[PDB]
Design an enzyme around this catalytic site. Sequence first.
Site, PDB file in Angstrom:
ATOM      1  CG  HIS A  69      85.937   7.940  71.820  1.00 26.44           C
ATOM      2  ND1 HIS A  69      84.558   7.971  71.840  1.00 26.44           N
ATOM      3  CD2 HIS A  69      86.310   7.328  70.664  1.00 26.44           C
ATOM      4  CE1 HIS A  69      84.124   7.459  70.701  1.00 26.44           C
ATOM      5  NE2 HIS A  69      85.180   7.055  69.966  1.00 26.44           N
ATOM      6  CG  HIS A  73      89.400   3.615  72.024  1.00 24.56           C
ATOM      7  ND1 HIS A  73      88.874   2.583  71.309  1.00 24.56           N
ATOM      8  CD2 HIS A  73      89.493   4.655  71.172  1.00 24.56           C
ATOM      9  CE1 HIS A  73      88.655   2.971  70.067  1.00 24.56           C
ATOM     10  NE2 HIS A  73      89.070   4.233  69.953  1.00 24.56           N
ATOM     11  CG  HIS A 107      92.774   6.588  66.984  1.00 23.19           C
ATOM     12  ND1 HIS A 107      93.136   5.702  67.944  1.00 23.19           N
ATOM     13  CD2 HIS A 107      91.440   6.473  66.844  1.00 23.19           C
ATOM     14  CE1 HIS A 107      92.049   5.100  68.400  1.00 23.19           C
ATOM     15  NE2 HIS A 107      90.997   5.563  67.767  1.00 23.19           N
ATOM     16  CG  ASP A 108      89.596   8.339  69.177  1.00 23.56           C
ATOM     17  OD1 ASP A 108      89.208   9.080  68.250  1.00 23.56           O
ATOM     18  OD2 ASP A 108      89.180   7.189  69.338  1.00 23.56           O
ATOM     19  CG  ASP A 218      88.521   3.705  65.724  1.00 18.50           C
ATOM     20  OD1 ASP A 218      88.693   3.726  66.979  1.00 18.50           O
ATOM     21  OD2 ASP A 218      87.984   4.569  65.095  1.00 18.50           O
ATOM     22  CD  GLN A 270      76.412  -3.113  69.323  1.00 20.09           C
ATOM     23  OE1 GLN A 270      77.428  -3.709  68.942  1.00 20.09           O
ATOM     24  NE2 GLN A 270      76.327  -1.800  69.345  1.00 20.09           N
TER      25      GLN A 270
HETATM   26  C1  JBV Z   1      80.372  -1.925  68.926  1.00 14.39           C
HETATM   27  C2  JBV Z   1      80.601  -0.583  68.306  1.00 14.39           C
HETATM   28  N1  JBV Z   1      81.831  -0.237  68.013  1.00 14.39           N
HETATM   29  C3  JBV Z   1      82.071   0.992  67.449  1.00 14.39           C
HETATM   30  C4  JBV Z   1      81.122   1.898  67.145  1.00 14.39           C
HETATM   31  C5  JBV Z   1      81.373   3.237  66.538  1.00 14.39           C
HETATM   32  N2  JBV Z   1      79.780   1.491  67.467  1.00 14.39           N
HETATM   33  N3  JBV Z   1      78.671   2.203  67.242  1.00 14.39           N
HETATM   34  C6  JBV Z   1      77.730   1.450  67.759  1.00 14.39           C
HETATM   35  C7  JBV Z   1      76.283   1.815  67.786  1.00 14.39           C
HETATM   36  C8  JBV Z   1      75.406   0.953  66.897  1.00 14.39           C
HETATM   37  C9  JBV Z   1      73.968   1.358  66.912  1.00 14.39           C
HETATM   38  N4  JBV Z   1      73.155   1.311  67.975  1.00 14.39           N
HETATM   39  C10 JBV Z   1      71.997   1.802  67.469  1.00 14.39           C
HETATM   40  N5  JBV Z   1      70.911   1.953  68.226  1.00 14.39           N
HETATM   41  C11 JBV Z   1      70.684   1.104  69.360  1.00 14.39           C
HETATM   42  C12 JBV Z   1      69.334   1.554  69.882  1.00 14.39           C
HETATM   43  C13 JBV Z   1      68.637   2.248  68.708  1.00 14.39           C
HETATM   44  C14 JBV Z   1      67.218   1.613  68.235  1.00 14.39           C
HETATM   45  F1  JBV Z   1      66.145   1.910  69.021  1.00 14.39           F
HETATM   46  F2  JBV Z   1      66.780   2.243  67.111  1.00 14.39           F
HETATM   47  C15 JBV Z   1      69.671   2.293  67.576  1.00 14.39           C
HETATM   48  N6  JBV Z   1      72.000   2.140  66.194  1.00 14.39           N
HETATM   49  N7  JBV Z   1      73.308   1.806  65.853  1.00 14.39           N
HETATM   50  C16 JBV Z   1      73.786   2.016  64.497  1.00 14.39           C
HETATM   51  N8  JBV Z   1      78.160   0.266  68.252  1.00 14.39           N
HETATM   52  C17 JBV Z   1      79.470   0.306  68.054  1.00 14.39           C
HETATM   53 MG    MG Z   2      87.847   8.862  66.802  1.00 11.12          MG
HETATM   54 ZN    ZN Z   3      88.935   5.458  68.191  1.00 10.86          ZN
END
Ligand code: JBV
Ligand code: MG
Ligand code: ZN
Length: 314
Positions: A69, A73, A107-108, A218, A270
Amino acid sequence: QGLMQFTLPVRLCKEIELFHFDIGPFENMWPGIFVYMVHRSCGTSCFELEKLCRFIMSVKKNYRRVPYHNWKHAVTVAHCMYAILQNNHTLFTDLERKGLLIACLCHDLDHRGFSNSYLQKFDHPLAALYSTSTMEQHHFSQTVSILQLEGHNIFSTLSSSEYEQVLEIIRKAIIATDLALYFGNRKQLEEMYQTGSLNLNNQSHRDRVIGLMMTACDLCSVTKLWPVTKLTANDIYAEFWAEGDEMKKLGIQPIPMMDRDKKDEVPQGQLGFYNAVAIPCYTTLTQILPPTEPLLKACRDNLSQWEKVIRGEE
Ligand SMILES: Cc1ncc(C)n2nc(CCc3nc(N4CC[C@H](C(F)F)C4)nn3C)nc12
Ligand SMILES: [Mg+2]
Ligand SMILES: [Zn+2]
Protein backbone atom coordinates in the site's frame (compact mmCIF):
# COMPACT_ATOMS: atom_id res chain seq x y z
CA GLN A 1 3.60 27.78 -19.10
CA GLY A 2 0.57 26.69 -21.30
CA LEU A 3 2.62 25.36 -24.33
CA MET A 4 4.49 22.80 -21.98
CA GLN A 5 3.13 19.27 -22.74
CA PHE A 6 4.88 16.44 -20.79
CA THR A 7 5.96 13.65 -23.26
CA LEU A 8 7.25 10.15 -22.59
CA PRO A 9 9.78 7.94 -24.36
CA VAL A 10 8.23 6.10 -27.33
CA ARG A 11 7.77 2.67 -25.61
CA LEU A 12 5.99 4.41 -22.65
CA CYS A 13 4.03 6.78 -24.95
CA LYS A 14 2.47 3.68 -26.62
CA GLU A 15 2.21 1.16 -23.76
CA ILE A 16 0.71 3.68 -21.18
CA GLU A 17 -2.54 3.62 -23.28
CA LEU A 18 -2.89 -0.18 -22.59
CA PHE A 19 -4.71 -1.60 -19.51
CA HIS A 20 -1.72 -3.92 -18.69
CA PHE A 21 1.02 -1.16 -18.58
CA ASP A 22 3.52 -1.45 -15.67
CA ILE A 23 4.76 2.03 -14.55
CA GLY A 24 8.23 0.56 -13.99
CA PRO A 25 10.83 0.61 -11.23
CA PHE A 26 12.06 4.24 -11.71
CA GLU A 27 10.28 6.06 -8.82
CA ASN A 28 11.32 9.53 -10.12
CA MET A 29 9.33 9.02 -13.37
CA TRP A 30 5.99 8.22 -11.65
CA PRO A 31 5.05 11.93 -11.13
CA GLY A 32 5.76 12.68 -14.80
CA ILE A 33 3.68 9.62 -15.76
CA PHE A 34 0.76 10.88 -13.62
CA VAL A 35 0.90 14.47 -15.04
CA TYR A 36 1.07 12.94 -18.57
CA MET A 37 -2.10 11.01 -17.72
CA VAL A 38 -3.92 14.10 -16.32
CA HIS A 39 -2.96 16.20 -19.39
CA ARG A 40 -4.32 13.61 -21.88
CA SER A 41 -7.55 12.54 -20.05
CA CYS A 42 -8.43 16.07 -18.77
CA GLY A 43 -6.43 18.76 -20.73
CA THR A 44 -3.32 20.92 -19.83
CA SER A 45 -6.07 23.39 -18.61
CA CYS A 46 -7.50 21.15 -15.75
CA PHE A 47 -4.79 22.14 -13.18
CA GLU A 48 -2.11 24.82 -12.68
CA LEU A 49 1.11 22.78 -13.26
CA GLU A 50 3.03 24.34 -10.23
CA LYS A 51 0.07 23.54 -7.89
CA LEU A 52 -0.40 19.96 -9.23
CA CYS A 53 3.39 19.18 -8.97
CA ARG A 54 3.35 20.43 -5.33
CA PHE A 55 0.20 18.32 -4.62
CA ILE A 56 1.72 15.14 -6.29
CA MET A 57 4.89 15.49 -4.14
CA SER A 58 2.91 16.08 -0.86
CA VAL A 59 0.78 13.01 -1.68
CA LYS A 60 3.97 10.91 -2.32
CA LYS A 61 5.45 12.14 1.03
CA ASN A 62 2.32 10.87 2.87
CA TYR A 63 2.46 7.28 1.54
CA ARG A 64 4.69 5.06 3.73
CA ARG A 65 7.45 2.53 2.88
CA VAL A 66 5.18 -0.59 3.23
CA PRO A 67 5.50 -3.58 0.83
CA TYR A 68 2.17 -3.03 -1.08
CA HIS A 69 0.00 0.00 0.00
CA ASN A 70 2.73 2.41 -1.17
CA TRP A 71 3.27 5.26 -3.66
CA LYS A 72 3.81 2.78 -6.58
CA HIS A 73 0.37 1.23 -5.82
CA ALA A 74 -1.20 4.75 -5.84
CA VAL A 75 0.18 5.48 -9.34
CA THR A 76 -0.64 1.94 -10.62
CA VAL A 77 -4.31 2.42 -9.55
CA ALA A 78 -4.47 5.90 -11.24
CA HIS A 79 -2.99 4.53 -14.51
CA CYS A 80 -5.81 1.84 -14.59
CA MET A 81 -8.42 4.62 -14.00
CA TYR A 82 -6.71 6.60 -16.86
CA ALA A 83 -7.05 3.62 -19.25
CA ILE A 84 -10.75 3.27 -18.29
CA LEU A 85 -11.41 7.00 -18.80
CA GLN A 86 -9.62 7.04 -22.20
CA ASN A 87 -11.46 3.88 -23.49
CA ASN A 88 -14.87 5.52 -22.46
CA HIS A 89 -14.17 9.09 -23.68
CA THR A 90 -17.77 10.41 -23.83
CA LEU A 91 -19.41 8.63 -20.76
CA PHE A 92 -17.78 10.90 -18.10
CA THR A 93 -18.12 14.57 -17.05
CA ASP A 94 -15.20 17.08 -16.88
CA LEU A 95 -15.36 16.97 -13.05
CA GLU A 96 -15.38 13.13 -12.96
CA ARG A 97 -12.25 13.06 -15.16
CA LYS A 98 -10.58 15.66 -12.77
CA GLY A 99 -11.79 13.99 -9.54
CA LEU A 100 -11.18 10.27 -10.26
CA LEU A 101 -7.45 10.33 -11.18
CA ILE A 102 -6.84 12.42 -7.99
CA ALA A 103 -9.05 10.03 -6.00
CA CYS A 104 -6.94 7.07 -7.24
CA LEU A 105 -3.61 8.83 -6.43
CA CYS A 106 -4.96 9.58 -2.92
CA HIS A 107 -7.02 6.43 -2.21
CA ASP A 108 -4.56 4.70 0.19
CA LEU A 109 -2.88 7.87 1.64
CA ASP A 110 -0.96 7.21 4.92
CA HIS A 111 -1.76 3.45 4.80
CA ARG A 112 0.14 1.57 7.55
CA GLY A 113 0.01 -1.96 5.98
CA PHE A 114 -2.85 -3.17 8.27
CA SER A 115 -6.50 -4.00 7.55
CA ASN A 116 -9.52 -2.19 9.12
CA SER A 117 -9.99 -5.44 11.07
CA TYR A 118 -6.50 -5.22 12.68
CA LEU A 119 -7.03 -1.56 13.60
CA GLN A 120 -10.35 -2.61 15.33
CA LYS A 121 -8.76 -5.46 17.25
CA PHE A 122 -5.69 -3.40 18.19
CA ASP A 123 -8.12 -0.62 19.29
CA HIS A 124 -6.23 2.00 17.24
CA PRO A 125 -7.51 5.60 17.72
CA LEU A 126 -8.62 5.67 14.01
CA ALA A 127 -11.11 2.82 14.89
CA ALA A 128 -12.85 5.05 17.52
CA LEU A 129 -12.95 8.05 15.09
CA TYR A 130 -14.40 5.86 12.17
CA SER A 131 -16.38 2.62 13.00
CA THR A 132 -16.58 1.44 9.34
CA SER A 133 -14.31 1.86 6.33
CA THR A 134 -11.75 2.95 9.00
CA MET A 135 -8.67 3.38 6.76
CA GLU A 136 -10.74 4.64 3.79
CA GLN A 137 -12.22 7.56 5.84
CA HIS A 138 -8.64 8.32 6.96
CA HIS A 139 -7.50 8.29 3.26
CA PHE A 140 -10.16 10.94 2.33
CA SER A 141 -9.36 12.96 5.49
CA GLN A 142 -5.63 13.03 4.52
CA THR A 143 -6.63 14.06 0.94
CA VAL A 144 -8.58 17.12 2.23
CA SER A 145 -5.56 17.96 4.51
CA ILE A 146 -3.09 18.04 1.61
CA LEU A 147 -5.61 20.04 -0.53
CA GLN A 148 -5.74 22.75 2.22
CA LEU A 149 -1.92 23.19 2.47
CA GLU A 150 -0.67 26.57 1.12
CA GLY A 151 -0.23 26.29 -2.67
CA HIS A 152 -1.86 22.79 -2.98
CA ASN A 153 -5.47 23.73 -3.97
CA ILE A 154 -5.50 22.20 -7.47
CA PHE A 155 -9.32 22.76 -7.61
CA SER A 156 -8.93 26.56 -6.87
CA THR A 157 -10.38 27.49 -10.36
CA LEU A 158 -13.64 25.51 -9.64
CA SER A 159 -16.88 27.27 -8.42
CA SER A 160 -17.90 26.70 -4.76
CA SER A 161 -20.41 24.00 -5.88
CA GLU A 162 -18.24 22.43 -8.65
CA TYR A 163 -15.56 22.22 -5.87
CA GLU A 164 -18.12 20.49 -3.55
CA GLN A 165 -19.21 18.04 -6.33
CA VAL A 166 -15.55 17.06 -7.06
CA LEU A 167 -14.69 16.54 -3.27
CA GLU A 168 -17.91 14.44 -3.07
CA ILE A 169 -16.80 12.31 -6.11
CA ILE A 170 -13.36 11.80 -4.44
CA ARG A 171 -14.96 10.86 -1.06
CA LYS A 172 -17.40 8.32 -2.56
CA ALA A 173 -14.59 6.99 -4.87
CA ILE A 174 -12.15 6.50 -1.94
CA ILE A 175 -14.84 4.95 0.35
CA ALA A 176 -15.67 2.44 -2.47
CA THR A 177 -12.07 1.05 -2.23
CA ASP A 178 -13.28 -0.64 0.99
CA LEU A 179 -13.54 -4.18 -0.35
CA ALA A 180 -16.20 -5.05 2.39
CA LEU A 181 -18.48 -2.64 0.46
CA TYR A 182 -17.71 -4.02 -3.02
CA PHE A 183 -19.76 -7.28 -2.82
CA GLY A 184 -23.08 -5.50 -2.19
CA ASN A 185 -22.15 -2.77 -4.70
CA ARG A 186 -21.47 -5.29 -7.50
CA LYS A 187 -24.66 -7.38 -6.65
CA GLN A 188 -26.84 -4.24 -6.93
CA LEU A 189 -25.14 -3.35 -10.27
CA GLU A 190 -25.52 -6.95 -11.64
CA GLU A 191 -29.30 -6.78 -10.84
CA MET A 192 -29.82 -3.24 -12.29
CA TYR A 193 -27.92 -4.19 -15.51
CA GLN A 194 -30.05 -7.38 -15.97
CA THR A 195 -33.51 -5.96 -15.12
CA GLY A 196 -32.45 -3.01 -17.43
CA SER A 197 -33.08 -0.46 -14.59
CA LEU A 198 -29.40 0.74 -14.85
CA ASN A 199 -29.65 4.50 -15.73
CA LEU A 200 -26.37 6.57 -16.05
CA ASN A 201 -28.40 9.84 -15.58
CA ASN A 202 -29.39 8.55 -12.08
CA GLN A 203 -26.66 10.09 -9.85
CA SER A 204 -26.90 7.12 -7.35
CA HIS A 205 -26.27 4.70 -10.31
CA ARG A 206 -23.22 6.65 -11.56
CA ASP A 207 -21.96 6.57 -7.95
CA ARG A 208 -22.23 2.74 -7.98
CA VAL A 209 -20.52 2.49 -11.43
CA ILE A 210 -17.60 4.71 -10.21
CA GLY A 211 -17.31 2.53 -7.08
CA LEU A 212 -17.02 -0.57 -9.30
CA MET A 213 -14.42 1.27 -11.46
CA MET A 214 -12.50 2.03 -8.16
CA THR A 215 -12.54 -1.66 -7.12
CA ALA A 216 -11.36 -2.55 -10.69
CA CYS A 217 -8.39 -0.07 -10.63
CA ASP A 218 -7.54 -1.03 -7.01
CA LEU A 219 -7.38 -4.79 -7.92
CA CYS A 220 -5.55 -4.14 -11.31
CA SER A 221 -2.40 -6.19 -10.30
CA VAL A 222 -4.46 -9.27 -11.46
CA THR A 223 -4.81 -7.72 -15.01
CA LYS A 224 -1.05 -7.34 -15.63
CA LEU A 225 1.47 -9.54 -17.44
CA TRP A 226 1.91 -12.76 -15.40
CA PRO A 227 5.41 -11.85 -14.00
CA VAL A 228 4.07 -8.47 -12.65
CA THR A 229 0.97 -10.24 -11.18
CA LYS A 230 3.11 -12.91 -9.51
CA LEU A 231 5.66 -10.43 -7.96
CA THR A 232 2.88 -8.03 -6.79
CA ALA A 233 1.24 -11.05 -5.01
CA ASN A 234 4.54 -11.45 -2.97
CA ASP A 235 4.22 -7.78 -1.81
CA ILE A 236 0.52 -8.36 -0.98
CA TYR A 237 1.29 -11.39 1.21
CA ALA A 238 4.31 -9.60 2.84
CA GLU A 239 1.78 -7.12 4.30
CA PHE A 240 -0.88 -9.75 5.11
CA TRP A 241 1.68 -12.01 6.88
CA ALA A 242 3.08 -9.12 9.02
CA GLU A 243 -0.58 -8.41 9.99
CA GLY A 244 -0.87 -12.14 10.83
CA ASP A 245 2.19 -11.91 13.09
CA GLU A 246 0.68 -8.80 14.82
CA MET A 247 -2.62 -10.71 15.27
CA LYS A 248 -0.68 -13.56 16.98
CA LYS A 249 1.06 -10.91 19.19
CA LEU A 250 -2.42 -9.82 20.41
CA GLY A 251 -3.13 -13.58 21.25
CA ILE A 252 -5.47 -14.08 18.19
CA GLN A 253 -5.26 -16.79 15.46
CA PRO A 254 -5.23 -14.79 12.18
CA ILE A 255 -7.47 -15.79 9.23
CA PRO A 256 -5.64 -18.19 6.82
CA MET A 257 -4.96 -15.27 4.30
CA MET A 258 -2.61 -13.67 6.91
CA ASP A 259 -0.80 -16.76 8.32
CA ARG A 260 2.76 -17.17 6.91
CA ASP A 261 2.52 -20.82 8.14
CA LYS A 262 0.08 -21.34 5.17
CA LYS A 263 2.58 -20.10 2.48
CA ASP A 264 2.05 -23.32 0.44
CA GLU A 265 -1.72 -22.54 -0.03
CA VAL A 266 -1.11 -19.20 -1.87
CA PRO A 267 -2.04 -20.63 -5.29
CA GLN A 268 -5.39 -21.94 -3.87
CA GLY A 269 -5.99 -18.59 -1.99
CA GLN A 270 -5.46 -16.70 -5.31
CA LEU A 271 -7.98 -19.03 -7.15
CA GLY A 272 -10.61 -18.30 -4.47
CA PHE A 273 -9.79 -14.57 -4.77
CA TYR A 274 -10.02 -14.54 -8.62
CA ASN A 275 -13.31 -16.60 -8.42
CA ALA A 276 -14.88 -14.77 -5.40
CA VAL A 277 -13.69 -11.19 -6.22
CA ALA A 278 -11.63 -10.32 -9.31
CA ILE A 279 -13.58 -12.17 -12.07
CA PRO A 280 -17.07 -11.05 -10.90
CA CYS A 281 -15.61 -7.53 -10.60
CA TYR A 282 -14.21 -7.34 -14.18
CA THR A 283 -17.25 -9.27 -15.61
CA THR A 284 -19.87 -6.79 -14.26
CA LEU A 285 -17.55 -3.85 -15.27
CA THR A 286 -17.30 -5.20 -18.88
CA GLN A 287 -21.18 -5.57 -19.04
CA ILE A 288 -21.58 -1.90 -18.00
CA LEU A 289 -18.49 -0.50 -19.90
CA PRO A 290 -17.83 -2.81 -22.88
CA PRO A 291 -14.39 -1.35 -23.82
CA THR A 292 -12.87 -2.44 -20.39
CA GLU A 293 -12.99 -6.07 -21.61
CA PRO A 294 -9.15 -6.34 -21.78
CA LEU A 295 -9.17 -6.21 -17.90
CA LEU A 296 -11.51 -9.29 -17.76
CA LYS A 297 -9.44 -11.11 -20.41
CA ALA A 298 -6.12 -10.36 -18.60
CA CYS A 299 -7.75 -11.43 -15.26
CA ARG A 300 -8.96 -14.79 -16.71
CA ASP A 301 -5.39 -15.30 -18.16
CA ASN A 302 -3.83 -14.82 -14.66
CA LEU A 303 -6.46 -17.18 -13.04
CA SER A 304 -5.37 -19.71 -15.64
CA GLN A 305 -1.68 -19.04 -14.66
CA TRP A 306 -2.44 -19.76 -10.92
CA GLU A 307 -4.22 -23.00 -11.99
CA LYS A 308 -0.95 -23.95 -13.80
CA VAL A 309 1.02 -23.23 -10.58
CA ILE A 310 -1.21 -25.66 -8.62
CA ARG A 311 -0.75 -28.41 -11.39
CA GLY A 312 3.08 -28.12 -10.89
CA GLU A 313 3.36 -26.72 -14.55
CA GLU A 314 4.90 -23.38 -13.14
C1 JBV B 1 -3.99 -10.39 -5.95
C2 JBV B 1 -4.73 -9.66 -4.88
N1 JBV B 1 -5.07 -8.41 -5.10
C3 JBV B 1 -5.74 -7.71 -4.13
C4 JBV B 1 -6.12 -8.21 -2.94
C5 JBV B 1 -6.85 -7.46 -1.88
N2 JBV B 1 -5.75 -9.59 -2.73
N3 JBV B 1 -6.02 -10.31 -1.64
C6 JBV B 1 -5.43 -11.45 -1.89
C7 JBV B 1 -5.42 -12.62 -0.95
C8 JBV B 1 -6.22 -13.81 -1.44
C9 JBV B 1 -6.22 -14.95 -0.47
N4 JBV B 1 -5.15 -15.66 -0.10
C10 JBV B 1 -5.69 -16.54 0.79
N5 JBV B 1 -4.94 -17.42 1.44
C11 JBV B 1 -3.73 -17.93 0.85
C12 JBV B 1 -3.23 -18.94 1.86
C13 JBV B 1 -4.46 -19.35 2.69
C14 JBV B 1 -4.86 -20.92 2.67
F1 JBV B 1 -4.09 -21.74 3.45
F2 JBV B 1 -6.03 -21.11 3.33
C15 JBV B 1 -5.60 -18.44 2.21
N6 JBV B 1 -6.99 -16.45 1.00
N7 JBV B 1 -7.31 -15.42 0.12
C16 JBV B 1 -8.69 -14.96 0.01
N8 JBV B 1 -4.83 -11.53 -3.10
C17 JBV B 1 -5.05 -10.33 -3.63
MG1 MG C 1 -7.18 0.76 0.54
ZN1 ZN D 1 -5.49 0.41 -2.88
